[PDB]
Amino acid sequence: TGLLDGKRILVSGIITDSSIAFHIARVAQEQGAQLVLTGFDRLRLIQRITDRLPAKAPLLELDVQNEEHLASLAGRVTEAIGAGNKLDGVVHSIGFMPQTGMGINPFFDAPYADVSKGIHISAYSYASMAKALLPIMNPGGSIVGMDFDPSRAMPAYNWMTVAKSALESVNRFVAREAGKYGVRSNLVAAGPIRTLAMSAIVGGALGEEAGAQIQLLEEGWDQRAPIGWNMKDATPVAKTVCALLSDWLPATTGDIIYADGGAHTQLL
Amino acid sequence: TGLLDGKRILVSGIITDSSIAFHIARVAQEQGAQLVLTGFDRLRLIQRITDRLPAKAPLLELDVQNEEHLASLAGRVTEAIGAGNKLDGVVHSIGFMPQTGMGINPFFDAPYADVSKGIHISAYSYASMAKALLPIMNPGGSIVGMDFDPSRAMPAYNWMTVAKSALESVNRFVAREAGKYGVRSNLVAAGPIRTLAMSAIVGGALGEEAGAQIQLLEEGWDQRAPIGWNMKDATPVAKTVCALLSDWLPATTGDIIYADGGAHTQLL
């Protein structure tokens, strides 16, 4: 009766109703999870977005670069879920890389300050969140972050791909920490999804050549995917995150599950 | 109401009540799947074993090297599940390598005839089974085979590790075929499990040095696994197979899920 029946799951990374985290949250609630959400910066916006979720969920502010937000997280969530209750699940669906960065836009021209910001928010924050939240997670718990496969370089994604490589590496370390809590840590490597930001990129936000490359990447995905890939549909990835949040992948950690249509297994 | 509520799933590879497939079957039935089982050679034995499953399941003979069994499979299962019904799930949990082979017992001394037999039953049969069964599988279906991680060589498992490397490669091709049917094909790379055969090996069936090496491998697994590994417990791997059989990994194919405690992500 619900994949996630009775689980308390924190879901970060909702910014629009096309956010992967929005779908993760929706599916998680459809599957009986009780949610706490974290949002960055535009919390009035995020509350209005998340009102459309099948169930209400407390929305907490988390700027993953903050420190004080991080320090007060755990307390703020236990307050939201009630004293003596702990998280069963944590979803990191946070990513950012300054344009600079990420297209466009010579790889070599991204200032380290921008790269570092990107890696902070996209990779290091996975350890941050796990640090903040593991003290309030139950044995049998699950931390899941959003990834894409960075094992091979690719056009446009540039330093974001590096940030994913760092994230994957971080996840493997987080798994070592999380294990002491009976908690799993895994990533979901998604195929490309037409999120608002992503649509804006294919639309040229970051230069025509970046857009053209992403579109090429999207098409080759689908072709390569033995079961196809629908970049307009985040549900299969939400479902995969929910599988990791459930008790049905109980021996998997420090790992990456590829919700990418099988594209990464193919080549051509 | 059951991860696998209403799914018809064929499960090969039951030979004892400590078989990984036995646990896969049990968990699958606990989760509402309707099963057809295939067994090799000792079908009276296998029926008696499988009587202990929470639900009855037709037991069909399948010797994966046979050809005629393969040719008549599909027909024999549609007969068992009823005309107009198709499989949603297929579990390959079949492995064999002649001792020779697999310890012991110099890698170089395994005759190709023995290796070939091993690869036939352990790798090629995954394509065989998919060939036989995909014509009687539903869109949204799932084929799952049992794997262990062969990306690095290891003591004792010798040609069986090669057979797993071939199996993984076969799986990626099977995924291409299965996709045309809306069907996923994936492997579960398990940590070591104290199956009867495996206990017999650690007990010295294949030489003292093979046994000692497997025991060393088992211990290092557990240590490496951020969440530990219990070689006496096949349930976490059955559960993982069930996750792949469910609709909750819908964008994963040609892939390997590691139900190994996270050990392969670690090193030390």
Place this chain on the structure above:
Amino acid sequence: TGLLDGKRILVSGIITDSSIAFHIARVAQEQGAQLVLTGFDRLRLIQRITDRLPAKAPLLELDVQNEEHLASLAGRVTEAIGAGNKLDGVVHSIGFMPQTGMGINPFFDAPYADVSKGIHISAYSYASMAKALLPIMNPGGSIVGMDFDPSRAMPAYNWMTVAKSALESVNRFVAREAGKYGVRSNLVAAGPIRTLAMSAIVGGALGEEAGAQIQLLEEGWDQRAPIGWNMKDATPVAKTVCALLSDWLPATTGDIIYADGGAHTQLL
């Protein structure tokens, strides 16, 4: 004065003057290696081909499926190189998969007998050759086999890709044996090369669709390769084999060096 100055190196796999092994041999001789060659089946042809090598080299018959050839190899080479001399280098450049097999031509329709033959010649023979030859190899020696990257499935190459997956796995085991002799074992994963057989395939020998797929694969290689890929030029791969045969990769074994233009590192 010659990368391979003074090394005695056995090179299998010459069948035409466009054979990768022909280029390996030529470059090896240019670099001061003394060669023994092995050839399969058409030894009059192979002698005539190899007369074009910058230096003479004894040509020995080796049918890698034979057993007696294998058993008498070592003796036949020590005879060719002189009593008390041993090999420093061994090149396996042997591959075969029955059409059936390898295009075309449904993956599922390849009979196991054909697959097994393919794996025998393409994967198992690497262990065979190492078994035969390690007793007559010097410490500091190097065994190198020809590979292509099978980590992702691909059109057309079908069971040959599986045979490469098995070969890579075999190589890792061969490395364990070879190490006891102070000998390295590595593979070179080449990009596609317009060998006679390969040109015949792109020309349609194995069906129009196989040809079209290989041509697509060849083009995408080159595009993906950060330094490009020239399928008409086997020299960069011969050179790479020679690097593995030299003393300049002394801490590398059980490994794969990708002489593929960097294509496998890229994606798009």
Place this chain on the structure above:
Amino acid sequence: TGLLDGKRILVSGIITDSSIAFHIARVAQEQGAQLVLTGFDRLRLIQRITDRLPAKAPLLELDVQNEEHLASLAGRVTEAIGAGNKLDGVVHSIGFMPQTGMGINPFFDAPYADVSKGIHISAYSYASMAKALLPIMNPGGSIVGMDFDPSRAMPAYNWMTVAKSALESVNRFVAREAGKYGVRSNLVAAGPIRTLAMSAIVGGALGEEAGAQIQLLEEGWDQRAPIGWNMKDATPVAKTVCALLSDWLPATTGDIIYADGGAHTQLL
């Protein structure tokens, strides 16, 4: 006559005579390369160290976090090698992670400022150096960085492992840039080497438990390495860097060569 006969090669990362870069430089000079060296911070020390090299080499200051050093590099090297001469080779042998960081010393307790510094010097600087130097590199050129395998998490190395994951990812992007110059970019993943810093760690500089873990890691390396691993001997890795700097790996880029005794191919 010298693997690197006539090549002009810049070698960063010499700080002591046990530095991997010192051995890279020595071997490179033994092989006929003309060197320019870069050193960080303690240039009087570094000059005194490098006086022991078989040949003199101009020593240029490079603090890879500086910007002005980076901007003036290229000009300073062309000055050292003479107008109208360009580099054939670049060696990045630069790594740093604040203790914090790297033992000890909870993974979660490393402040992002420290991690970011580590990633700056250890990963991002590979792109920095390539940016600075590719404009003064010849076609057929080679950039090589020092890596260790971060694909699996490990004790003690903590954020340095993450920095290596980022470095590997950066290398793949650098390969895309370098290719436009006819230049290869590759990494050498070394086994552990008893550098001064490393000896200080195993000696307990970073806590007893970090030391014990590194020693365990070192022992398991050697055991796993089919040809053994000698942590006191940096020569096999210098040689491997020299192989990448030569013309003998001409079709390899965006790649990693494992000079680790074959340990990463093994498991147990």
